[PDB]
């Protein structure tokens, strides 16, 4: 893909690249085959904690939650996801979004 961006680096004065999902700062120079002048990540300072990221790898029955294709067809994982969604609907406010891994898996789960 770097070829598609290769002339842009070699013709314009500078290129500005920014995104909210830039966890590795070194793969992109490798992906685009170039050496950016500055590679800086701006840490977010909050007076009030607006985000509460949580990881739930265990279901109600302590089932090991995984999204591997071997475990995607597991009925227990689907039931745990359904119970989690039910509790979230009964607890969390109206806005609920759930991102699955594939369309077929989502349809089977539904």
């Amino acid at each position: 893909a770097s070829l598609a961006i290769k002339p842009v680096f070699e013709r314009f004065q500078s290129v500005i690249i920014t995104s909210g999902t830039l966890s590795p700062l070194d793969i992109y120079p490798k992906i685009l085959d170039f050496h950016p002048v500055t590679m800086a990540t701006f840490t977010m300072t909050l007076a009030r904690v607006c985000l509460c990221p949580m990881i739930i790898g265990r279901g109600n029955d302590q089932v090991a939650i995984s999204s591997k294709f071997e475990t995607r067809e597991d009925i227990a994982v689907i039931r745990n996801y359904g119970n989690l969604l039910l509790e979230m609907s009964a607890v969390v406010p109206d806005g609920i979004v759930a991102f699955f891994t594939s369309y077929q898996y989502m349809e089977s789960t539904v």
Partner: protein, 614 residues
């Protein structure tokens, strides 16, 4: 020294130090240990005591533990030496540790882990790192007979020697006499003769913290060690056994009381283990499977202990089992093992690692001292009250209801002095009315009712008059299963009458109300295990401390009072309370059978008609 009041004057032998509140333990020189639960170091003290001391009583506040040689051997097998144990005891004992207990610990620990028994090539070898002990033990006449000898009678020559299989259990008792107990050590990872099996643990299986602790204690230094683990009924004991079998990865043998236990174990293995069904075989009298490729075999003790001539196929299966070397063996309901026929099964079967699981170990015949060497020391025993607090099991509401004896029955009760007297108090019309009122109340409350009665005649009469299903000796298995399914699914029927067969002959469906009318005669452990198996945790009433109901109908001023008092001792030692109920509220308003005294006279006529034959 004994005081005039009977208290043992242990003040002189126990030097008290000023660290009273911080140290929670009292260590009397008699071997008993007292622990206070309200102490902040209770959890650490509880963990230390469980590892080294066998509990005696665990009520709410003060727990009493006992120190035994088997417990010391188990602690040594865990990996604890004398120095650390002594240091921890002195750090926790309110008074100084008496030297008598100190010398008792020193003597036992040094003698542990000396003699080793190895089962290789279907042959038993006794070897040790100290040939002087081996040479000394040769002089014993019992050991001479137990030692295997050549076909000409010549004795066979860390040097090991073959030992007769038929004399293995005899050698186990002789080790106690020689004070050199055997070591049940198995090469968990160094095993090469027995290949591994494609069996793993499903992710749906979750090990509770006490279960994981018990398993880790059993797996001393990563090696499986033979022993006994005591867990309450319904606490996933079958799940623990399946997990242990998966961890072992070697050939597995499981033994149950009846075919129902075999089916339950097979279902649990399919539910939690990854072993293929082709490698799972049932050596039962009706449903038989080919022993070829049988990675895990599930059977019953009586099937392996059938002294009478067996079927031709069963003989072939037994021959294959004897030829096959079993890395792991699993035994259920260890309390029946002390029977001679079931003990002979241990000699018959050649297994490396043997693990026994049950709910109780207090045999009324106290044949447990030999059991400590038949399998091994008790590896773990969970606290019933603690698991109730954790919510793993239902917090049972126990009550003893005293049913007054009718004067007509009472005079005949005193008149009769033989064994026919059981029918008189087991058929109390007042007890019948109390049971009827309880059944009505629990049906109005929509509760599952299980009425247990050892007496066949009394159980049948109660079930017939109350018009409820009855389970007794024959109880054709198809009809039994139909009745069980009706109890589980049909809301109209929620009361099942079960005879003595309800202890272990089949699986008990989850219920909430258990009423015991008839007693075995002092089965302090059998009925306790039955009660544990009947009642399980029920969702919805977790917050309430009374979610499971147990009632014991006892005839006043009869010998049933003594039987109940003797039986409930085991449960009281577990901290279970028992409230005496003489008056039942609501019986006056509700209409019950035998309201008129002439009906009770008719019941007396019926009972007297049932002679001593019944």
């Amino acid at each position: 020294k004994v005081d005039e009041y009977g208290a043992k004057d242990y003040r002189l032998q126990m030097p008290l130090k000023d660290d009273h509140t911080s140290r929670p333990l009292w260590v009397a020189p008699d071997g008993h240990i007292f622990l206070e639960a309200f102490s902040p170091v209770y959890k650490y003290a509880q963990d230390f005591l469980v590892a080294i001391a066998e509990p005696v009583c665990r009520p709410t506040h003060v727990h009493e533990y006992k120190l035994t040689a088997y417990s010391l051997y188990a602690a040594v097998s865990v990996g604890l030496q004398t120095s650390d144990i002594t240091e921890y005891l002195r750090k926790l004992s309110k008074t100084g540790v008496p030297d008598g207990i100190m010398q008792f610990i020193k003597l036992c620990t040094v003698s542990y882990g000396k003699v080793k028994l190895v089962l290789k090539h279907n042959r038993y070898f006794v070897e040790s790192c100290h040939p002087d002990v081996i040479q000394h033990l040769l002089q014993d006449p019992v050991i001479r007979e137990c030692r295997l000898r050549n076909s000409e009678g010549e004795a066979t020559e860390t040097v090991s020697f073959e030992v007769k299989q038929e004399m293995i259990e005899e050698l186990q008792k002789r080790c106690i006499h020689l004070e050199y107990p055997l070591l049940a050590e198995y090469d968990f990872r160094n095993d090469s003769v027995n290949p591994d099996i494609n069996i793993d643990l499903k992710p749906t299986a979750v090990l509770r913290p006490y279960q994981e602790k018990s398993l880790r204690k059993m797996f001393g230094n990563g090696r499986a060690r033979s022993g006994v683990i005591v867990l309450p009924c319904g606490a996933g004991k079958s799940l623990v056994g399946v997990t242990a079998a998966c961890t072992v990865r070697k050939r597995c043998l499981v033994l149950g009381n009846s075919a129902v236990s075999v089916e339950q174990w097979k279902a649990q293995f399919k539910m939690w283990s990854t072993i293929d069904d082709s490698q799972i075989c049932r050596f039962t009298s009706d449903a038989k499977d080919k022993p070829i490729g049988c990675s895990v075999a599930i059977s019953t003790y009586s099937m392996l202990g059938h002294t009478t001539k067996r079927s031709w196929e069963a003989e072939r299966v037994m021959e294959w089992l004897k030829t096959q070397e079993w890395g792991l063996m699993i035994l259920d309901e260890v309390h029946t093992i002390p029977a001679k026929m079931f003990r002979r099964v241990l000699t018959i079967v050649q297994a490396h690692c043997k693990l026994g699981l049950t709910a109780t170990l207090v045999r009324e015949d106290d044949k447990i001292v030999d059991l400590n060497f038949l399998i091994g020391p008790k590896l773990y025993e969970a606290n019933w009250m603690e698991l109730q607090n954790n919510g793993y099991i239902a917090k049972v509401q126990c009550a003893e209801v005293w049913c007054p004896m009718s004067p007509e029955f009472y005079r005949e009760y005193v008149a009769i002095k033989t064994k026919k007297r059981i029918l008189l108090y087991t058929m109390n019309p007042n007890k019948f009315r109390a049971c009827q009122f309880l059944i009505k109340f629990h049906e109005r409350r929509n509760d599952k009712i299980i009425v247990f009665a050892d007496n066949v005649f009394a159980l049948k009469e109660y079930a017939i008059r109350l018009n409820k299903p009855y389970i007794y000796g024959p109880t054709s298995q198809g009809e039994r299963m139909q009745i069980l399914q009706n109890f589980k699914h049909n809301p109209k029927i929620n009361t099942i009458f079960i005879s003595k067969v309800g202890d272990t002959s089949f699986d008990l469906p989850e219920a909430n109300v258990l009423i015991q009318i008839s007693s075995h005669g002092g089965s302090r452990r059998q009925e306790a295990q039955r009660l544990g198996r009947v009642l399980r945790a029920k969702k919805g009433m977790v917050a309430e401390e009374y979610n499971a109901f147990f009632y014991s109908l006892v005839s006043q001023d009869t010998q049933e009072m003594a039987y109940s008092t003797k039986r409930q001792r085991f449960l009281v030692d577990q901290g279970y309370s028992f409230k005496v109920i003489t008056k039942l509220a609501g019986m006056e308003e509700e209409d019950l059978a035998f309201s008129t005294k002439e009906e009770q006279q008719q019941l007396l006529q019926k009972v007297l008609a049932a002679t001593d034959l019944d």
